[PDB]
Amino acid sequence: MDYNLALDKAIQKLHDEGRYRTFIDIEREKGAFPKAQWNRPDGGKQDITVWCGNDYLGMGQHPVVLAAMHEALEAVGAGSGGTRNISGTTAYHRRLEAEIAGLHQKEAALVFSSAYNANDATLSTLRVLFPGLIIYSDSLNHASMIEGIKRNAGPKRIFRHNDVAHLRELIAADDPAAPKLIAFESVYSMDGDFGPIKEICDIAEEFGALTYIDEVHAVGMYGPRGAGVAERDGLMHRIDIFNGTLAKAYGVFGGYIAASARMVDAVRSYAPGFIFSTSLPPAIAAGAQASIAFLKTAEGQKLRDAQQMHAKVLKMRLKALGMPIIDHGSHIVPVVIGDPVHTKAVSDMLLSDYGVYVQPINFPTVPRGTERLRFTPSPVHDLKQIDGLVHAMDLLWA
Amino acid sequence: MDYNLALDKAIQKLHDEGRYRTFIDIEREKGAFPKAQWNRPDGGKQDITVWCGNDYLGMGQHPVVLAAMHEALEAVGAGSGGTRNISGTTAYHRRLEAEIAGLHQKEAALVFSSAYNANDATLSTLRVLFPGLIIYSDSLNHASMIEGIKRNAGPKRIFRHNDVAHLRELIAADDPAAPKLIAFESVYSMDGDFGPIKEICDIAEEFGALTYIDEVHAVGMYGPRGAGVAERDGLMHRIDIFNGTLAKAYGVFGGYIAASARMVDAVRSYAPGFIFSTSLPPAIAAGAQASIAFLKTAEGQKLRDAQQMHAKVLKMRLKALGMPIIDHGSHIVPVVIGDPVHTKAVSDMLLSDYGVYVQPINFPTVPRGTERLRFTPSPVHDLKQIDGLVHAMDLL
Ligand SMILES: Cc1ncc(COP(=O)(O)O)c(CNCC(=O)O)c1O
Ligand SMILES: Cc1ncc(COP(=O)(O)O)c(CNCC(=O)O)c1O
Secondary structure, three states: OOHHHHHHHHHHHHHHHOOOOOOOOEEEOOOOOOEEEEEOOOOOEEEEEEOOOOOOOOHHHOHHHHHHHHHHHHHHOOOOOOEHHHHHOOHHHHHHHHHHHHHOOOOEEEEEOOHHHHHHHHHHHHHHHOOOOEEEEEOOOOHHHHHHHHHOOOOEEEEOOOOHHHHHHHHHHOOOOOOEEEEEEOEOOOOOOEOOHHHHHHHHHHHOEEEEEEOOOOOOOOOOOOOOHHHHOOOHHHOOEEEEEOOOOOOOOOEEEEEOHHHHHHHHHHOHHHHOOEOOOHHHHHHHHHHHHHHOOHHHHHHHHHHHHHHHHHHHHHHOOOOOEOOOOOOOEEEEOOOHHHHHHHHHHHHHHHOEEOOEEOOOOOOOOOOEEEEOOOOOOOOOHHHHHHHHHHHHOO | OOHHHHHHHHHHHHHHOOOOOOOOOEEEOOOOOOEEEEEOOOOOEEEEEEOOOOOOOOHHHOHHHHHHHHHHHHHHOOOOOOEHHHHHOEHHHHHHHHHHHHHHOOOEEEEEOOHHHHHHHHHHHHHHHOOOOEEEEEOOOOHHHHHHHHHOOOOEEEEOOOOHHHHHHHHHHOOOOOOEEEEEEOEOOOOOOEOOHHHHHHHHHHHOEEEEEEOOOOOOOOOOOOOOHHHHOOOHHHOOEEEEEOOOOOOOOOEEEEEOHHHHHHHHHHOHHHHOOEOOOHHHHHHHHHHHHHHOOHHHHHHHHHHHHHHHHHHHHHHOOOOOEOOOOOOOEEEEOOOHHHHHHHHHHHHHHHOEEOOEEOOOOOOOOOOEEEEOOOOOOOHHHHHHHHHHHHOO
16 A cells, blocks of 8 residues: 555545635734735735635624733633643633523533534434434535534434425434434525524424524524524524534634533533533633624624625625626625636636635535635625625626 | 433433532633632632643743734734635644644644544544555544544554554454554553554554554653654654644644645545634634744743653652552653542542642543542642642641
8 A cells, every 4th residue: 555645646636626725825904804914825915805704793803802802811821721621611611601501592501612513522422312313414514513413323314405395204204202303504604595494493393303503604693682593583492402603703713502401411421522622712712702792782783784784785786797696695695606617717816816805615615516606795894895896706707 | 202301311320420520610820820710619719729730831821822822813803714715724824834844843734623623533534535444543542533533434443552562463463455544642641651652653664554643742741842752752753643732731722733745635625624614713823833932942841841840749749648649750640549439529628628629530531440630740830839739638
């Protein structure tokens, strides 16, 4: 065997599929989002506008977030210095968990290094807590969820994206005594569409299944307090477990689940992914807590209203140019190119000629043949760079 | 069908084995480590001394670490705002990766949210890159590694802890054409013992296997530049992949792997655990980079020398009291109680009566019947506090 040969092959394979990814090295200018310095491969520096980021509401530069982080650094230092069990549980962490519990109106919450870890650990550990559990998973569920669901051996059923009738057909065919869980997303990251929360809850209630919703692309942005789509539709009480991130609209890092005291205490107690890893830096927890707290206020609601507005304006302007934009009514604005190489070519031109950064999105992030640009207008994308983006797209489709 | 009934069952089972864990709520006093405020369950506040933390060298309060973190917050904000692919690759990450590569003298490095993620993602993704891979794993490998090894279906072979002859017997039995990888640790977290790097590398070279070493409890602390035990024994060139953390001796958060550019580029390109998660906050990256850079200098060497010294003094003083301490020559100082309930009882008393915090360690962190206290003397545990601790133990 030559390990080096096999590596080469593995990499070659990416180039052959047109899906080898080049990262763009940037430094966002705090206080001037969405401006960033792009560190070009030739050693030069160029001002660009970030159009694809997930700091959806500009919270990453918010003074109340940054103040709380500076404070915590000075009070307790750089990290926790331990796992939750061995000296890594601090007030910042439980203050954060209580903030999150409140958000989702749940008894408890549990913080992980990332929402990825939260899904992976929780979904796999649930198989252990509920012997013979059957997990029903939306075909476009995020990788973190897929990974959690398959991690431990056990029955899984994949239902066609947003297809509640297929869901019913699958669930009704299975052993009615077996514990069941349905896992889906409120907002799907790449299509920008909504999961049918009500219909799924109705099915879960009819068949005695647990509901597990990933609201990673909704928290901070939907509902009167930024608790997500289930809050918007008045459905939070119908959801057994929430999964969210602190890294996107909340502007910081980390993730969580929110659920009853029982569910949390059990996950907390049996999930290797939670037990065996250093807890989040207290500064990270301080920032995220401040972010959530802020987004619950009417001042946070202004940021949401502004976001929605800018998304509507961007979609209008792009349709007005005759462009391949799919509109499912969310803040995500995908423009489908359908080819991994041509997507990178359009992205490359936007970056270098117009200072427009929108990463080309390919497999495995989206299905092959659906490679796309994915715009994320935020409160800080004013009615003038929208103007700057559109003009560049127009100049470019010549 | 009845979900809560299952939950109460799973929880009870923890109380029944005595292994139900109560967390201790603390706030470390920056600039005064190892002092911390303990937030007692009754609402009171009490000054305590942290004796079980993993901020092994006090880097979590180091001014160069904190300065780099404050700077980054002001320059770029709270988080990256994206995955490495979608806007979260920054200069801070790239400089941090170069710093690590340099530490292990490797072509490349890759940063993950944690060393846990790095092990899990890497070990499981290697099965995909090397079809039919057989992984040989030390029986006391960390959970993160076990989890990475089992995640994807595929052949695994568990060798008796530190038993190189069992390793040989296993590997010689297997198909000689199959790709092989041996996964072990340089310093084992709970026993505080060293893995036999040279003997494992010899076996790996004889049978054409990859070597994967987890140096999580060694980086920053061993070798003339803090690169770990392999650096200390002059063996880094013989290790295919390094796994390390930025959250322990380095004082911050996150983890990584270090290997050749092709090895890194393939892991990066294939591992869902790397692709689908937000990149580390630039401030975290800045701090860790400053921490690694600092620990490579002669000034860092002073912190290591001091740590080793304090560990030796603690071990001496504990044996001089007749105590169940196992000494494998590392900075970790475990005192074996052997029972989960009595271990918590001793720990409780040390906290409440003496202001000594040392979490009681039980299953699944260590095998049942080997429950213990695990002391971690650092540069900041001056001869005064060591003297304080031993006196406290004695009277108990
Ligand atoms: C050997 C080993 N490897 C990896 C990890 C994962 O490190 P992260 O904190 O970067 O996720 C740990 C943490 N084990 C916890 C402890 O030391 O008690 C460990 O002990
Ligand atoms: C639906 C979904 N769920 C979970 C995560 C994981 O979140 P963390 O970064 O906090 O681990 C992501 C990130 N995927 C980023 C994206 O698709 O834009 C996601 O898109």
